[PDB]
Amino acid sequence: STQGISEDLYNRLVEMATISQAAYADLCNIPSTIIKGEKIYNAQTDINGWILRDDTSKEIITVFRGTGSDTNLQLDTNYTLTPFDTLPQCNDCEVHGGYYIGWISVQDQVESLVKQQASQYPDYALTVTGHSLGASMAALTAAQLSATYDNVRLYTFGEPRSGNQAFASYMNDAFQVSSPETTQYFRVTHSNDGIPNLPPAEQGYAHGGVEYWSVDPYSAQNTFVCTGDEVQCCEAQGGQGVNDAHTTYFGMTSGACTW
Ligand SMILES: *[C@@H]1O[C@H](CO)[C@@H](O)[C@H](O)[C@H]1NC(C)=O
């Protein structure tokens, strides 16, 4: 769809990409405006995340790492759709089965830690982010938080299709996706990243969010804002699986700590 984003938005996407890619390396060199809180971890699924707080921007940030282990790779491959029973009001919503196990395996930690921060800082916004598997963790987390808190924002990078169209439509409503001027769900893709094409749509999967498609060389002026139902932006490129475009967002490779 539309060429170019503002520098303020581009900076924000870069910031969330940095946090997402740092999650692969114990949060190396994240912005100095961020206080690191408690680690989120489950041993059966190897889901890793943290709760963070940025007082300068008045947000509580929850980040999940993406795939960093054989266990994570196993989760990635479970494409069975599972009812999103977390959110009974999400009518007919179903999510990627592996990422649902991931979500369940950390839910109590996420909800308790977010609750603790939000109780103390009740005016702060809630932001969720991650890359790849971490991006789908972020989507399911942000869905849950949106049912009980105000001002939930979701920034994903290289996100798989996280669930069915019912789930996408729920997210589109909850995150004001009907305009790029109001969206609180920024689904960031890069060049021909293959992960945003999986699971295939024809298995009953769909994306939500406004897509922000980064074309190389990366910059605000070379990022596209993609909406509606046509096959376009990243998904049109037909990338296959985990490829170079998937690993490196805004010049930052997962875990590399070059920022
Ligand atoms: C896939 O995940 C679902 C839960 O979302 C689980 O019930 C199912 O057993 C998993 N499939 C496999 C092969 O483990």
PDB file of C-alpha atoms and ligand atoms in Angstrom:
ATOM      1  CA  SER A   1       0.000   0.000   0.000  1.00  0.00           C
ATOM      2  CA  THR A   2       1.465   3.464   1.047  1.00  0.00           C
ATOM      3  CA  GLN A   3       5.149   4.498   0.841  1.00  0.00           C
ATOM      4  CA  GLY A   4       6.750   6.244   3.844  1.00  0.00           C
ATOM      5  CA  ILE A   5       6.298   6.693   7.552  1.00  0.00           C
ATOM      6  CA  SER A   6       7.162   9.517   9.873  1.00  0.00           C
ATOM      7  CA  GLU A   7      10.555   9.678  11.548  1.00  0.00           C
ATOM      8  CA  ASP A   8       8.857   9.549  15.005  1.00  0.00           C
ATOM      9  CA  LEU A   9       7.114   6.287  14.052  1.00  0.00           C
ATOM     10  CA  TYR A  10      10.239   4.839  12.439  1.00  0.00           C
ATOM     11  CA  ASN A  11      12.175   5.542  15.630  1.00  0.00           C
ATOM     12  CA  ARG A  12       9.516   3.803  17.657  1.00  0.00           C
ATOM     13  CA  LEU A  13       9.604   0.711  15.426  1.00  0.00           C
ATOM     14  CA  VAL A  14      13.412   0.676  15.635  1.00  0.00           C
ATOM     15  CA  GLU A  15      13.233   0.923  19.453  1.00  0.00           C
ATOM     16  CA  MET A  16      10.842  -2.043  19.712  1.00  0.00           C
ATOM     17  CA  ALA A  17      12.906  -4.034  17.172  1.00  0.00           C
ATOM     18  CA  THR A  18      15.976  -3.427  19.329  1.00  0.00           C
ATOM     19  CA  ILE A  19      14.236  -4.692  22.477  1.00  0.00           C
ATOM     20  CA  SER A  20      12.955  -7.734  20.503  1.00  0.00           C
ATOM     21  CA  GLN A  21      16.333  -8.620  19.047  1.00  0.00           C
ATOM     22  CA  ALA A  22      18.082  -8.017  22.412  1.00  0.00           C
ATOM     23  CA  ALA A  23      15.817 -10.565  24.038  1.00  0.00           C
ATOM     24  CA  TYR A  24      17.972 -13.246  22.352  1.00  0.00           C
ATOM     25  CA  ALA A  25      20.997 -12.023  24.386  1.00  0.00           C
ATOM     26  CA  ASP A  26      19.816 -11.251  27.947  1.00  0.00           C
ATOM     27  CA  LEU A  27      18.680  -7.757  26.821  1.00  0.00           C
ATOM     28  CA  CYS A  28      22.013  -6.417  25.775  1.00  0.00           C
ATOM     29  CA  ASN A  29      22.156  -2.669  25.074  1.00  0.00           C
ATOM     30  CA  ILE A  30      18.459  -1.901  25.300  1.00  0.00           C
ATOM     31  CA  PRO A  31      17.616   1.810  25.546  1.00  0.00           C
ATOM     32  CA  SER A  32      18.829   3.576  28.678  1.00  0.00           C
ATOM     33  CA  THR A  33      15.221   4.770  29.329  1.00  0.00           C
ATOM     34  CA  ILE A  34      14.313   1.178  30.286  1.00  0.00           C
ATOM     35  CA  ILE A  35      14.395  -0.507  33.711  1.00  0.00           C
ATOM     36  CA  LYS A  36      14.625  -4.299  33.517  1.00  0.00           C
ATOM     37  CA  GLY A  37      12.229  -6.175  35.755  1.00  0.00           C
ATOM     38  CA  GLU A  38      11.597  -9.856  36.308  1.00  0.00           C
ATOM     39  CA  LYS A  39      12.442 -12.664  33.940  1.00  0.00           C
ATOM     40  CA  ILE A  40       9.573 -14.724  32.500  1.00  0.00           C
ATOM     41  CA  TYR A  41      10.496 -18.361  31.932  1.00  0.00           C
ATOM     42  CA  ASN A  42       9.041 -21.819  31.567  1.00  0.00           C
ATOM     43  CA  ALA A  43      11.150 -24.901  31.401  1.00  0.00           C
ATOM     44  CA  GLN A  44       8.847 -27.158  29.355  1.00  0.00           C
ATOM     45  CA  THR A  45       8.418 -24.699  26.448  1.00  0.00           C
ATOM     46  CA  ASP A  46      11.618 -22.661  26.854  1.00  0.00           C
ATOM     47  CA  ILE A  47       9.674 -19.449  26.546  1.00  0.00           C
ATOM     48  CA  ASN A  48      11.836 -16.544  27.671  1.00  0.00           C
ATOM     49  CA  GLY A  49      10.661 -12.991  28.247  1.00  0.00           C
ATOM     50  CA  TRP A  50      10.925 -10.004  30.616  1.00  0.00           C
ATOM     51  CA  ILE A  51       8.789  -7.247  32.035  1.00  0.00           C
ATOM     52  CA  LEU A  52      10.379  -3.802  31.605  1.00  0.00           C
ATOM     53  CA  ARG A  53       9.396  -0.210  32.501  1.00  0.00           C
ATOM     54  CA  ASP A  54      10.142   3.019  30.671  1.00  0.00           C
ATOM     55  CA  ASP A  55       9.256   5.935  32.973  1.00  0.00           C
ATOM     56  CA  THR A  56      10.172   8.492  30.377  1.00  0.00           C
ATOM     57  CA  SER A  57       7.468   7.312  28.022  1.00  0.00           C
ATOM     58  CA  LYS A  58       5.190   5.956  30.800  1.00  0.00           C
ATOM     59  CA  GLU A  59       4.961   2.426  29.522  1.00  0.00           C
ATOM     60  CA  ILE A  60       5.286  -1.011  30.976  1.00  0.00           C
ATOM     61  CA  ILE A  61       6.859  -3.228  28.229  1.00  0.00           C
ATOM     62  CA  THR A  62       6.591  -7.003  28.066  1.00  0.00           C
ATOM     63  CA  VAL A  63       9.052  -8.653  25.628  1.00  0.00           C
ATOM     64  CA  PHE A  64       9.323 -12.254  24.488  1.00  0.00           C
ATOM     65  CA  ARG A  65      12.294 -13.890  22.855  1.00  0.00           C
ATOM     66  CA  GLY A  66      11.721 -15.783  19.626  1.00  0.00           C
ATOM     67  CA  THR A  67      13.142 -19.145  18.659  1.00  0.00           C
ATOM     68  CA  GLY A  68      16.336 -20.006  20.450  1.00  0.00           C
ATOM     69  CA  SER A  69      16.161 -23.753  21.012  1.00  0.00           C
ATOM     70  CA  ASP A  70      15.030 -27.105  19.657  1.00  0.00           C
ATOM     71  CA  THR A  71      12.058 -26.868  22.049  1.00  0.00           C
ATOM     72  CA  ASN A  72      11.006 -23.562  20.542  1.00  0.00           C
ATOM     73  CA  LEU A  73      11.342 -24.998  17.058  1.00  0.00           C
ATOM     74  CA  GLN A  74       8.973 -27.786  18.051  1.00  0.00           C
ATOM     75  CA  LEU A  75       6.407 -25.256  19.170  1.00  0.00           C
ATOM     76  CA  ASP A  76       6.752 -23.371  15.906  1.00  0.00           C
ATOM     77  CA  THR A  77       5.719 -26.485  13.955  1.00  0.00           C
ATOM     78  CA  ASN A  78       2.425 -27.184  15.764  1.00  0.00           C
ATOM     79  CA  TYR A  79      -0.016 -25.625  13.322  1.00  0.00           C
ATOM     80  CA  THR A  80      -3.115 -27.138  14.852  1.00  0.00           C
ATOM     81  CA  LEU A  81      -5.674 -24.370  15.601  1.00  0.00           C
ATOM     82  CA  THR A  82      -6.726 -24.324  19.252  1.00  0.00           C
ATOM     83  CA  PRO A  83      -9.651 -22.325  20.795  1.00  0.00           C
ATOM     84  CA  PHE A  84      -8.300 -19.247  22.563  1.00  0.00           C
ATOM     85  CA  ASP A  85     -10.057 -20.114  25.829  1.00  0.00           C
ATOM     86  CA  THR A  86      -8.030 -17.378  27.654  1.00  0.00           C
ATOM     87  CA  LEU A  87     -10.457 -14.930  26.122  1.00  0.00           C
ATOM     88  CA  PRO A  88     -14.008 -16.367  26.183  1.00  0.00           C
ATOM     89  CA  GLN A  89     -15.327 -13.148  24.669  1.00  0.00           C
ATOM     90  CA  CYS A  90     -13.146 -13.744  21.548  1.00  0.00           C
ATOM     91  CA  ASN A  91     -15.988 -15.367  19.687  1.00  0.00           C
ATOM     92  CA  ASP A  92     -14.823 -18.420  17.714  1.00  0.00           C
ATOM     93  CA  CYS A  93     -11.180 -17.356  18.101  1.00  0.00           C
ATOM     94  CA  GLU A  94      -8.505 -19.920  17.544  1.00  0.00           C
ATOM     95  CA  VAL A  95      -4.709 -19.570  17.712  1.00  0.00           C
ATOM     96  CA  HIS A  96      -1.601 -21.444  16.568  1.00  0.00           C
ATOM     97  CA  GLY A  97      -1.457 -24.508  18.767  1.00  0.00           C
ATOM     98  CA  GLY A  98       2.202 -24.362  19.624  1.00  0.00           C
ATOM     99  CA  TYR A  99       2.162 -20.744  20.538  1.00  0.00           C
ATOM    100  CA  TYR A 100      -0.912 -21.414  22.700  1.00  0.00           C
ATOM    101  CA  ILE A 101       1.104 -23.936  24.702  1.00  0.00           C
ATOM    102  CA  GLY A 102       3.827 -21.305  24.947  1.00  0.00           C
ATOM    103  CA  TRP A 103       1.312 -18.754  26.180  1.00  0.00           C
ATOM    104  CA  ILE A 104      -0.241 -21.068  28.713  1.00  0.00           C
ATOM    105  CA  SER A 105       3.147 -22.056  30.009  1.00  0.00           C
ATOM    106  CA  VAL A 106       3.948 -18.444  31.022  1.00  0.00           C
ATOM    107  CA  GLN A 107       0.494 -16.936  31.485  1.00  0.00           C
ATOM    108  CA  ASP A 108       0.444 -16.889  35.285  1.00  0.00           C
ATOM    109  CA  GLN A 109       3.921 -15.201  35.350  1.00  0.00           C
ATOM    110  CA  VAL A 110       2.968 -12.642  32.714  1.00  0.00           C
ATOM    111  CA  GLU A 111      -0.374 -11.732  34.294  1.00  0.00           C
ATOM    112  CA  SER A 112       0.994 -11.520  37.822  1.00  0.00           C
ATOM    113  CA  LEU A 113       3.983  -9.376  36.859  1.00  0.00           C
ATOM    114  CA  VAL A 114       2.019  -7.068  34.611  1.00  0.00           C
ATOM    115  CA  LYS A 115      -0.600  -6.704  37.332  1.00  0.00           C
ATOM    116  CA  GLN A 116       2.103  -5.780  39.838  1.00  0.00           C
ATOM    117  CA  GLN A 117       3.538  -3.054  37.623  1.00  0.00           C
ATOM    118  CA  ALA A 118       0.168  -1.722  36.468  1.00  0.00           C
ATOM    119  CA  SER A 119      -1.086  -1.512  40.090  1.00  0.00           C
ATOM    120  CA  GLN A 120       1.828   0.690  41.000  1.00  0.00           C
ATOM    121  CA  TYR A 121       1.877   2.742  37.826  1.00  0.00           C
ATOM    122  CA  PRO A 122      -1.838   2.824  36.885  1.00  0.00           C
ATOM    123  CA  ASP A 123      -1.389   5.627  34.359  1.00  0.00           C
ATOM    124  CA  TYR A 124       1.262   3.871  32.290  1.00  0.00           C
ATOM    125  CA  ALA A 125       0.462   2.217  29.001  1.00  0.00           C
ATOM    126  CA  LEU A 126       1.084  -1.465  28.382  1.00  0.00           C
ATOM    127  CA  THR A 127       3.237  -2.422  25.442  1.00  0.00           C
ATOM    128  CA  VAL A 128       4.039  -5.964  24.192  1.00  0.00           C
ATOM    129  CA  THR A 129       6.740  -6.846  21.721  1.00  0.00           C
ATOM    130  CA  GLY A 130       8.788  -9.634  20.248  1.00  0.00           C
ATOM    131  CA  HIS A 131      10.274 -11.226  17.128  1.00  0.00           C
ATOM    132  CA  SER A 132       9.190 -14.438  15.399  1.00  0.00           C
ATOM    133  CA  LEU A 133       7.867 -16.930  18.044  1.00  0.00           C
ATOM    134  CA  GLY A 134       8.197 -13.991  20.437  1.00  0.00           C
ATOM    135  CA  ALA A 135       5.951 -11.942  18.205  1.00  0.00           C
ATOM    136  CA  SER A 136       3.174 -14.539  18.446  1.00  0.00           C
ATOM    137  CA  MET A 137       3.664 -14.699  22.214  1.00  0.00           C
ATOM    138  CA  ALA A 138       3.311 -10.951  22.205  1.00  0.00           C
ATOM    139  CA  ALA A 139       0.103 -11.103  20.162  1.00  0.00           C
ATOM    140  CA  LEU A 140      -1.610 -13.628  22.468  1.00  0.00           C
ATOM    141  CA  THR A 141      -0.374 -11.679  25.528  1.00  0.00           C
ATOM    142  CA  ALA A 142      -1.584  -8.369  24.144  1.00  0.00           C
ATOM    143  CA  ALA A 143      -4.955  -9.934  23.319  1.00  0.00           C
ATOM    144  CA  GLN A 144      -5.335 -11.006  26.925  1.00  0.00           C
ATOM    145  CA  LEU A 145      -4.205  -7.681  28.327  1.00  0.00           C
ATOM    146  CA  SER A 146      -6.571  -5.753  26.048  1.00  0.00           C
ATOM    147  CA  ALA A 147      -9.555  -7.400  27.792  1.00  0.00           C
ATOM    148  CA  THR A 148      -8.553  -5.920  31.167  1.00  0.00           C
ATOM    149  CA  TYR A 149      -6.422  -2.852  30.623  1.00  0.00           C
ATOM    150  CA  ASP A 150      -6.465   0.401  28.779  1.00  0.00           C
ATOM    151  CA  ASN A 151      -3.810   1.556  26.376  1.00  0.00           C
ATOM    152  CA  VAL A 152      -2.412  -1.718  25.226  1.00  0.00           C
ATOM    153  CA  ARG A 153       0.017  -1.504  22.275  1.00  0.00           C
ATOM    154  CA  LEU A 154       1.536  -4.385  20.275  1.00  0.00           C
ATOM    155  CA  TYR A 155       4.681  -4.174  18.148  1.00  0.00           C
ATOM    156  CA  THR A 156       5.655  -7.444  16.333  1.00  0.00           C
ATOM    157  CA  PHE A 157       8.546  -8.288  14.065  1.00  0.00           C
ATOM    158  CA  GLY A 158       8.540 -11.233  11.619  1.00  0.00           C
ATOM    159  CA  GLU A 159       5.295 -12.495  13.218  1.00  0.00           C
ATOM    160  CA  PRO A 160       3.778 -15.749  11.967  1.00  0.00           C
ATOM    161  CA  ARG A 161       0.052 -15.881  11.336  1.00  0.00           C
ATOM    162  CA  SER A 162      -0.901 -16.214  15.024  1.00  0.00           C
ATOM    163  CA  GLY A 163      -4.473 -17.526  14.588  1.00  0.00           C
ATOM    164  CA  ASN A 164      -7.692 -17.565  12.579  1.00  0.00           C
ATOM    165  CA  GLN A 165      -9.658 -14.769  11.027  1.00  0.00           C
ATOM    166  CA  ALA A 166     -11.907 -14.473  14.075  1.00  0.00           C
ATOM    167  CA  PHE A 167      -8.799 -13.784  16.173  1.00  0.00           C
ATOM    168  CA  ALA A 168      -7.399 -11.308  13.621  1.00  0.00           C
ATOM    169  CA  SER A 169     -10.719  -9.449  13.573  1.00  0.00           C
ATOM    170  CA  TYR A 170     -10.842  -9.327  17.352  1.00  0.00           C
ATOM    171  CA  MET A 171      -7.375  -7.819  17.373  1.00  0.00           C
ATOM    172  CA  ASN A 172      -8.266  -5.399  14.598  1.00  0.00           C
ATOM    173  CA  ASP A 173     -11.173  -4.107  16.683  1.00  0.00           C
ATOM    174  CA  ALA A 174      -9.303  -4.043  20.011  1.00  0.00           C
ATOM    175  CA  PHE A 175      -6.256  -2.280  18.568  1.00  0.00           C
ATOM    176  CA  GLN A 176      -8.007   0.233  16.303  1.00  0.00           C
ATOM    177  CA  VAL A 177      -6.474  -1.188  13.149  1.00  0.00           C
ATOM    178  CA  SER A 178      -9.113   0.426  10.855  1.00  0.00           C
ATOM    179  CA  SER A 179      -6.791   3.409  10.340  1.00  0.00           C
ATOM    180  CA  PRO A 180      -2.973   3.764  10.454  1.00  0.00           C
ATOM    181  CA  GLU A 181      -3.632   6.974  12.398  1.00  0.00           C
ATOM    182  CA  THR A 182      -5.276   5.082  15.236  1.00  0.00           C
ATOM    183  CA  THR A 183      -3.674   1.639  15.163  1.00  0.00           C
ATOM    184  CA  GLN A 184      -2.131   0.283  18.329  1.00  0.00           C
ATOM    185  CA  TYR A 185      -1.017  -2.916  16.538  1.00  0.00           C
ATOM    186  CA  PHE A 186       2.154  -2.446  14.401  1.00  0.00           C
ATOM    187  CA  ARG A 187       2.901  -5.706  12.563  1.00  0.00           C
ATOM    188  CA  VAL A 188       6.390  -5.075  11.182  1.00  0.00           C
ATOM    189  CA  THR A 189       7.768  -7.198   8.335  1.00  0.00           C
ATOM    190  CA  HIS A 190      10.953  -7.072   6.325  1.00  0.00           C
ATOM    191  CA  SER A 191      11.634  -7.601   2.625  1.00  0.00           C
ATOM    192  CA  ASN A 192      10.899 -11.240   1.791  1.00  0.00           C
ATOM    193  CA  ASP A 193      10.805 -12.659   5.341  1.00  0.00           C
ATOM    194  CA  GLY A 194       9.189 -16.078   4.975  1.00  0.00           C
ATOM    195  CA  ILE A 195       7.762 -16.298   8.511  1.00  0.00           C
ATOM    196  CA  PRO A 196       4.823 -13.934   7.868  1.00  0.00           C
ATOM    197  CA  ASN A 197       3.658 -16.455   5.258  1.00  0.00           C
ATOM    198  CA  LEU A 198       3.378 -19.331   7.758  1.00  0.00           C
ATOM    199  CA  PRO A 199       1.196 -21.138   8.602  1.00  0.00           C
ATOM    200  CA  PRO A 200      -0.321 -20.768   5.121  1.00  0.00           C
ATOM    201  CA  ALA A 201      -3.571 -18.763   4.993  1.00  0.00           C
ATOM    202  CA  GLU A 202      -5.393 -21.681   3.435  1.00  0.00           C
ATOM    203  CA  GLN A 203      -5.000 -23.681   6.656  1.00  0.00           C
ATOM    204  CA  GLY A 204      -7.422 -21.174   8.246  1.00  0.00           C
ATOM    205  CA  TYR A 205      -4.883 -18.618   9.442  1.00  0.00           C
ATOM    206  CA  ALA A 206      -4.885 -14.857   9.129  1.00  0.00           C
ATOM    207  CA  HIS A 207      -2.947 -11.776  10.175  1.00  0.00           C
ATOM    208  CA  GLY A 208      -4.309  -8.789  11.977  1.00  0.00           C
ATOM    209  CA  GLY A 209      -2.743  -5.431  12.532  1.00  0.00           C
ATOM    210  CA  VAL A 210      -1.478  -2.730  10.232  1.00  0.00           C
ATOM    211  CA  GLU A 211       1.579  -4.146   8.375  1.00  0.00           C
ATOM    212  CA  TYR A 212       4.694  -1.945   8.256  1.00  0.00           C
ATOM    213  CA  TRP A 213       6.825  -3.401   5.514  1.00  0.00           C
ATOM    214  CA  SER A 214      10.532  -2.510   5.667  1.00  0.00           C
ATOM    215  CA  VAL A 215      12.197  -2.621   2.236  1.00  0.00           C
ATOM    216  CA  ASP A 216      15.955  -2.396   1.896  1.00  0.00           C
ATOM    217  CA  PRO A 217      17.807  -0.182   2.294  1.00  0.00           C
ATOM    218  CA  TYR A 218      15.901   0.311   5.514  1.00  0.00           C
ATOM    219  CA  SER A 219      14.649   3.785   6.430  1.00  0.00           C
ATOM    220  CA  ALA A 220      11.442   5.658   7.140  1.00  0.00           C
ATOM    221  CA  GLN A 221      11.022   6.578   3.521  1.00  0.00           C
ATOM    222  CA  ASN A 222      11.449   2.913   2.476  1.00  0.00           C
ATOM    223  CA  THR A 223       8.871   1.514   4.930  1.00  0.00           C
ATOM    224  CA  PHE A 224       5.361   0.883   3.650  1.00  0.00           C
ATOM    225  CA  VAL A 225       2.038   0.942   5.469  1.00  0.00           C
ATOM    226  CA  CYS A 226      -0.086  -1.976   4.324  1.00  0.00           C
ATOM    227  CA  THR A 227      -3.812  -2.455   4.997  1.00  0.00           C
ATOM    228  CA  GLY A 228      -6.798  -4.384   3.659  1.00  0.00           C
ATOM    229  CA  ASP A 229      -7.162  -7.824   2.070  1.00  0.00           C
ATOM    230  CA  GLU A 230      -5.018  -7.875  -1.094  1.00  0.00           C
ATOM    231  CA  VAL A 231      -1.835  -9.975  -1.105  1.00  0.00           C
ATOM    232  CA  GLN A 232       0.828  -7.313  -0.912  1.00  0.00           C
ATOM    233  CA  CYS A 233       3.969  -6.133   0.907  1.00  0.00           C
ATOM    234  CA  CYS A 234       5.916  -8.950   2.653  1.00  0.00           C
ATOM    235  CA  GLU A 235       3.377 -11.695   1.977  1.00  0.00           C
ATOM    236  CA  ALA A 236       3.526 -10.998  -1.793  1.00  0.00           C
ATOM    237  CA  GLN A 237       7.261 -11.684  -1.902  1.00  0.00           C
ATOM    238  CA  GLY A 238       6.834 -15.416  -1.251  1.00  0.00           C
ATOM    239  CA  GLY A 239       9.835 -15.873   0.971  1.00  0.00           C
ATOM    240  CA  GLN A 240      10.354 -19.448   2.201  1.00  0.00           C
ATOM    241  CA  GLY A 241      10.812 -20.038   5.852  1.00  0.00           C
ATOM    242  CA  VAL A 242      13.540 -18.657   8.062  1.00  0.00           C
ATOM    243  CA  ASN A 243      15.685 -16.633   5.731  1.00  0.00           C
ATOM    244  CA  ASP A 244      18.110 -13.714   5.951  1.00  0.00           C
ATOM    245  CA  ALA A 245      15.278 -11.153   5.880  1.00  0.00           C
ATOM    246  CA  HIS A 246      13.739 -12.824   8.929  1.00  0.00           C
ATOM    247  CA  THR A 247      16.829 -12.640  11.091  1.00  0.00           C
ATOM    248  CA  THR A 248      17.696  -8.980  10.637  1.00  0.00           C
ATOM    249  CA  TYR A 249      15.209  -6.111  11.230  1.00  0.00           C
ATOM    250  CA  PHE A 250      16.397  -2.487  10.767  1.00  0.00           C
ATOM    251  CA  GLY A 251      19.938  -3.834  10.475  1.00  0.00           C
ATOM    252  CA  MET A 252      19.819  -5.687  13.826  1.00  0.00           C
ATOM    253  CA  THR A 253      20.311  -9.441  13.800  1.00  0.00           C
ATOM    254  CA  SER A 254      18.756 -11.530  16.588  1.00  0.00           C
ATOM    255  CA  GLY A 255      21.083 -11.686  19.561  1.00  0.00           C
ATOM    256  CA  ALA A 256      23.977  -9.873  17.819  1.00  0.00           C
ATOM    257  CA  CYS A 257      24.156  -6.853  20.109  1.00  0.00           C
ATOM    258  CA  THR A 258      25.572  -4.544  17.398  1.00  0.00           C
ATOM    259  CA  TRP A 259      23.298  -1.683  18.371  1.00  0.00           C
TER     260      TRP A 259
HETATM  261  C1  LIG B   1      -0.552 -28.672  19.455  1.00  0.00           C
HETATM  262  O1  LIG B   1      -0.947 -27.703  20.459  1.00  0.00           O
HETATM  263  C2  LIG B   1      -2.180 -27.991  21.091  1.00  0.00           C
HETATM  264  C3  LIG B   1      -2.520 -26.870  22.103  1.00  0.00           C
HETATM  265  O2  LIG B   1      -2.575 -25.608  21.477  1.00  0.00           O
HETATM  266  C4  LIG B   1      -2.118 -29.367  21.776  1.00  0.00           C
HETATM  267  O3  LIG B   1      -3.398 -29.649  22.350  1.00  0.00           O
HETATM  268  C5  LIG B   1      -1.720 -30.418  20.762  1.00  0.00           C
HETATM  269  O4  LIG B   1      -1.667 -31.658  21.426  1.00  0.00           O
HETATM  270  C6  LIG B   1      -0.398 -30.047  20.140  1.00  0.00           C
HETATM  271  N1  LIG B   1       0.025 -31.046  19.151  1.00  0.00           N
HETATM  272  C7  LIG B   1       1.072 -31.807  19.408  1.00  0.00           C
HETATM  273  C8  LIG B   1       1.444 -32.744  18.309  1.00  0.00           C
HETATM  274  O5  LIG B   1       1.750 -31.819  20.411  1.00  0.00           O
END
